[PDB]
Amino acid sequence: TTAAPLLALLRENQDSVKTYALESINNVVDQLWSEISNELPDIEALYDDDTFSDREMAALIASKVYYNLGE
Amino acid sequence: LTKSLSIAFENGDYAACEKLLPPIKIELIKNNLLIPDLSIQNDIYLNDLMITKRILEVGALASIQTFNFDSFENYFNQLKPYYFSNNHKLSESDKKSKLISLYLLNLLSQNNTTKFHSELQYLDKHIKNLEDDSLLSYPIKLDRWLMEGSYQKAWDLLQSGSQNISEFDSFTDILKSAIRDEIAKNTELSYDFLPLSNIKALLFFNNEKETEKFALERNWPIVNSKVYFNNQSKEKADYEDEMMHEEDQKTNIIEKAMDYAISIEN
Amino acid sequence: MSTDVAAAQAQSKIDLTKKKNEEINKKSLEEDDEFEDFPIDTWANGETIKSNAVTQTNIWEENWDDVEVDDDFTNELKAELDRYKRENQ
Amino acid sequence: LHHSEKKYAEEDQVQELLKVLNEISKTTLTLDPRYIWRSLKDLSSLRNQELLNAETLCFTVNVLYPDSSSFKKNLLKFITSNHKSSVPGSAELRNSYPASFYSVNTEKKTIEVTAEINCFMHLLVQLFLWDSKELEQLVEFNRKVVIPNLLCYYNLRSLNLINAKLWFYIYLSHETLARSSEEINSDNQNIILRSTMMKFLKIASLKHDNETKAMLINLILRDFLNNGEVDSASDFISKLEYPHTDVSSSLEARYFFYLSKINAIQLDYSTANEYIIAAIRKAPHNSKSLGFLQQSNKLHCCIQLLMGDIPELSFFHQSNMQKSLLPYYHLTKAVKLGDLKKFTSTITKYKQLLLKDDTYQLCVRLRSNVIKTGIRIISLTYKKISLRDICLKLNLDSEQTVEYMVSRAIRDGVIEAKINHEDGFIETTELLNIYDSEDPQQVFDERIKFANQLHDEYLVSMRYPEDKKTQQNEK
C-alpha cells in the first residue's frame, strides 16, 4: 500500500495533526521515499515557524529523502 | 463527540459540522493511535476502526459543502485502502458510495484528468466490476464528452445535474467554470474572429457582460463587435522570446556546425 | 509481429542458452502466455480467407478496403442508366 | 543404484559452481560470469528431477544452511520419504579436497565463501514448488530463506547478481496470489514487499551495480499495474535512475513495455507510442518471450487509436500472427468508419480479455474517439466541406455539434484544420512544402548525434574482448 495516509496528516490545519504526521513518516523515511516526496514541502514549511518544536524533526527527515533519491 | 459530528450531518446543519471539526481532528489522532494502520487486522481492530472511519466519512461530505477541499482530499486518502482490502472486511457504509463519486468530480474540475484516469483504474477493480454502480457513471460520462470534444452533451449533463442532488449540485458550478476556460483554448486555433453573439452561444453565457469579460481575459479586443483571437497568440510568442529556454530549443546554425566540428576533432 | 517483426528480433540479438533464461523472466513477470489465452478462452482463432490475398495472415500483401463488399459491379451498372435519366430529363 | 547415482550427481554440482565463484572474484566483467548461471539453471533442475529429486537434498546438506533443510525435506515426505535413499557418504562428503566443497573453510567457518553456491541452491527448490504451484505459505517459506543469505554472507556486487533471481520469485509468487483473490495475508505482506525492494534500490546505487537496480525497478512497477494503484506508478517515473551499462537487452524491453502503459494513463499517447516500438527493438525473441511479444502488439494498436490516426487493415495481416490480435483488428475497423454500434458489440463480447490485458480502461476513451477519428477521414478526403455535409456523414445532431468536436481535436492536434463560420464550411489547413522551412534541420540533428556516438563506442569495445580472453584459461 501507498503512503497516502501519511501525507494527508501533514496538510491538516490543526497543529496537533502536523506534529503527529512526522512521528509516522519518520519510521518509513528510508522504506518509502517515492511516495513521500509530494508533501516534502509541508515538511520544509514546519522548520520556518519557530512555534513548532518539530524544527528538529523536520530537518532530520528532510535530509534523508534527498539521499534516498541519490542526491 | 465522534458521535456528534454524525448526527449533525443528518440534522442538515453543516455549519454545525464545520464548527465541531477543530476538536474532531485532535481525537482523530487518538483513533489512529488505537489502530496499527493496516499491518495486522483483528476483529477488535474493526471495533476500534469503526471509531476512526466514522470521522472520515461524515467529515468528508461536510467539507464539500463548506468549501474545505484540502480536508476532503485528506479524509479520502486515509479511508480508501480500508474499503479496498479483502473485498471488504467491513469497512463498508452506505456513505461510501457518495464519496467515491464526488471524489472523481473533484479531480476533473482542477484539470487533474491525469489523476482521473489513474484513479478510475483502482475503482474499477474495487466496485465497478463487483458491486456495479455507486453513481460512478456521472463523472465518467463528463470525461467522455470532453475527450470526444462535444461540449453540448457535457453542458447538458451539468444542467440536469443541478436539477438533481447527490451533492452533484456543489460540483456542477465548478465544472461549469472549468469547461468555460477549456473552450477558449480550443477556439483560438479554430476562429480568427467571431460576432459577440456567436462567442456568447459557444462558451455558454447568459449575459454579454460575461462574454466580453471572458474575451478581455484572453486579451482579444471586442472592437468592431468582433473578437480577435490572434491578438493573444502574438503576446504568448513574445513572452517565450524574451526567455533563454526558447533560443537553444531552436538551435541556431552557427551553434550546430561548431558543436558538429568539435566531436570530430576530439 | 507489428512494425519491427520477429525476424529482426532473432537476427539482431541472437538466441543463445545465455539469453533464454532472461526471456523466461520477461514472460513470467508479465505472467503467462497470452498467445494461448485466446484459443482456449474464446474457442476461435484469427482471420480466414475470403477470396485469397485479402485476409488471413500471409506474406501476401493486402487491400485497405478488404472488409468492404464487392457491390461495385452493380454500382457502375446503375451509374450508366441513372446518368442517362438526369441528362435526358 | 541410488547410492552411486546421487553420489556422483552431488559432487559434480558443487564443482561447476565453485569455478564461476572464482571467475567473478577476478576483476569486473559482470555480464559473462552471470551468463554461466543462466545457461546452468535450466540444466541443473532437469538433472536433479531425473533419478529422484533428492539429488537436490545431497546438495542442500553440502552447503552451510540457515534453514533451507526443513523446507526441502517436507516435499520428499509427501511423495513418500526419500531420506533413506540419500544417505551420508553420498550426501555428505567434504573429503580432503575441494570439488565437493573445501574442507579448510568448512571446519573454520569464518572464512567460508559458500554464499553464492548457497544462492544457486535455494533457487532450485523454489522453482520445483513454483511449477507445482503452492501459494500463501510458499511466499512465506521463500521469503524466510532469502533474507538470511544477505545477512550471514557479506554483500558485494558479486552477491547482488545471483540474489537478483531470488528477488524475482518472492515478488512474483505474492502477485499471482494477489490476483487470485484478496486475503488478510496479501494486504499486509504487500506493504513489506513493496518497501524492502525500494530499500535495496538505493543500496544498488551506492554499489554502482547496474544489473541489480534494473531488476528491482521492474518488479515494483508491475505490482502497481496488477492492483491498479497507478497513482503510484506515476510518482515512480517522475524520477529516472534506470542505468543501461550492465542492464541486458531482455530487460530494456521490460522497462519500456510497462513505461508505455503509465504514459498512456497520463493521457500523453506520444511518448507511450514511442516506447512501445522501442520495447520491441531491445527485445530478443525466440519462443520464450512469445506471450510478452503478443501483448506488445496488442498494446501498440490501442495507443495508435488513442492518438486519432488509424493503423491499416494490412497492418494486422502483415503481423505474423492475428491469432490473438483478432479483437484489436476489430477495434481498428470500428473506430475507422466512425461507427458507434460496432464498438458497443465487440467491447461487451471480448470483456473478459480486455479486463485481463489492462486495455479496458483505454476503451472508455476509445468510445470517445470513435467520432473523433470519424472526422479524421472526412476532413482529409475533402479539403473544404460544409458543416451540414459532416452532419450527414456521421449523423450528428446539429451543425454546431460538428464545430465542438473538431475544435478539441485540433488543440490536440489530430485534424490540423480551421473552421470558418462566416462562409459555413470547414477548410482543412495545408502542410505546404516544409523543404523551404527549417524543419529538415531538426530531423538531421537527431541522426548526426546518434552516428557520432557509434564511432566513439566501437573504439572502447575493441579493448573489452581482449581483457576477457587474457583472463580466460588457455585454449
From Swiss-Prot, chain A:
Modification comment: N-acetylated by NAT1.
Described function: Acts as a regulatory subunit of the 26S proteasome which is involved in the ATP-dependent degradation of ubiquitinated proteins.
Assembly mode: Interacts with UBR1.
More info: Present with 4750 molecules/cell in log phase SD medium.
Protein family according to the UniProt entry: Belongs to the proteasome subunit S1 family.
Name of the protein: 26S proteasome regulatory subunit RPN2
Underlying gene: RPN2
Residue range from the parent sequence: 4 to 74 of 945
From Swiss-Prot, chain B:
GO biological process, one term: ubiquitin-dependent protein catabolic process
Gene name for this UniProt entry: RPN12
Keyword Secreted annotated: no
UniProt similarity note: Belongs to the proteasome subunit S14 family.
Gene3D superfamilies listed in its UniProt record: 1.25.40.990
Miscellaneous note of the record: Present with 9890 molecules/cell in log phase SD medium.
Keyword hit for Membrane: no
Designated name of the protein: 26S proteasome regulatory subunit RPN12
Alphabetical list of PROSITE patterns matching this protein: PCI
Source organism, top-level taxon: Eukaryota
Function according to Swiss-Prot or TrEMBL: Acts as a regulatory subunit of the 26S proteasome which is involved in the ATP-dependent degradation of ubiquitinated proteins. Necessary for activation of the CDC28 kinase.
InterPro entries: 26S_Psome_Rpn12, CSN8_PSD8_EIF3K, PCI_dom
Keywords assigned: Proteasome
The species this protein was found in: Saccharomyces cerevisiae (strain ATCC 204508 / S288c)
Residue ranges of every copy of the PCI domain listed in the record: 70-245
Entry GO CC: nucleus; proteasome complex; proteasome regulatory particle, lid subcomplex; proteasome storage granule
Swiss-Prot record, chain C:
Residues with PTM N-acetylserine: S2
Taxonomic superkingdom: Eukaryota
The UniProt record lists the keyword Acetylation: yes
Transmembrane segments: none
Keywords from the named record: Acetylation, Phosphoprotein, Proteasome, Transcription
GO terms (BP aspect): double-strand break repair via homologous recombination; filamentous growth; maintenance of DNA trinucleotide repeats; mRNA export from nucleus; positive regulation of transcription by RNA polymerase II; proteasome assembly; proteasome-mediated ubiquitin-dependent protein catabolic process; regulation of cell cycle
One MF term in the entry's GO annotations: molecular adaptor activity
GO cellular-component term (any): transcription export complex 2
Entry-annotated residues carrying Phosphoserine: S12
InterPro entries registered for this protein in UniProt: DSS1_SEM1
Effect of disrupting the coding gene: Impairs mRNA export and transcription elongation, and induces strong transcription-associated hyperrecombination phenotypes.
Gene3D superfamilies: 6.10.250.1210
Any further remark recorded for this protein: Present with 5590 molecules/cell in log phase SD medium.
Physiological role: Versatile protein that might stabilize multiple protein complexes involved in diverse pathways. Subunit of the 26S proteasome which plays a role in ubiquitin-dependent proteolysis. Also associates with the TREX-2 complex that is required for transcription-coupled mRNA export, and the COP9 signalosome, which is involved in deneddylation.
Subunit structure as annotated in this protein's UniProt entry: Part of the 26S proteasome. Associates with the nuclear pore complex (NPC)-associated TREX-2 complex and the COP9 signalosome. Interacts with CSN12 and THP3.
Family named by the database record: Belongs to the DSS1/SEM1 family.
Protein name: 26S proteasome complex subunit SEM1
UniProtKB/Swiss-Prot annotation, chain D:
Cellular compartments per GO CC: proteasome complex; proteasome regulatory particle, lid subcomplex
A GO term, aspect molecular function: enzyme regulator activity
Domain named PCI: residues: 253-433
Post-translational modification: N-acetylated by NAT1.
Coiled coil: none
Pfam families noted in UniProt: PCI, Rpn3_C
Single GO BP term: ubiquitin-dependent protein catabolic process
Skewed-composition ranges (Basic and acidic residues): 463-475
Superkingdom assignment: Eukaryota
Keyword terms of this UniProt record: Acetylation, Phosphoprotein, Proteasome
Annotated positions of the Phosphoserine modification: S437
Additional detail: Present with 16700 molecules/cell in log phase SD medium.
Role noted for this protein: Acts as a regulatory subunit of the 26S proteasome which is involved in the ATP-dependent degradation of ubiquitinated proteins.
Family (UniProt): Belongs to the proteasome subunit S3 family.
Subunit composition and interactions: The 26S proteasome is composed of a core protease, known as the 20S proteasome, capped at one or both ends by the 19S regulatory complex (RC). The RC is composed of at least 18 different subunits in two subcomplexes, the base and the lid, which form the portions proximal and distal to the 20S proteolytic core, respectively.
The protein's name in its UniProt record: 26S proteasome regulatory subunit RPN3
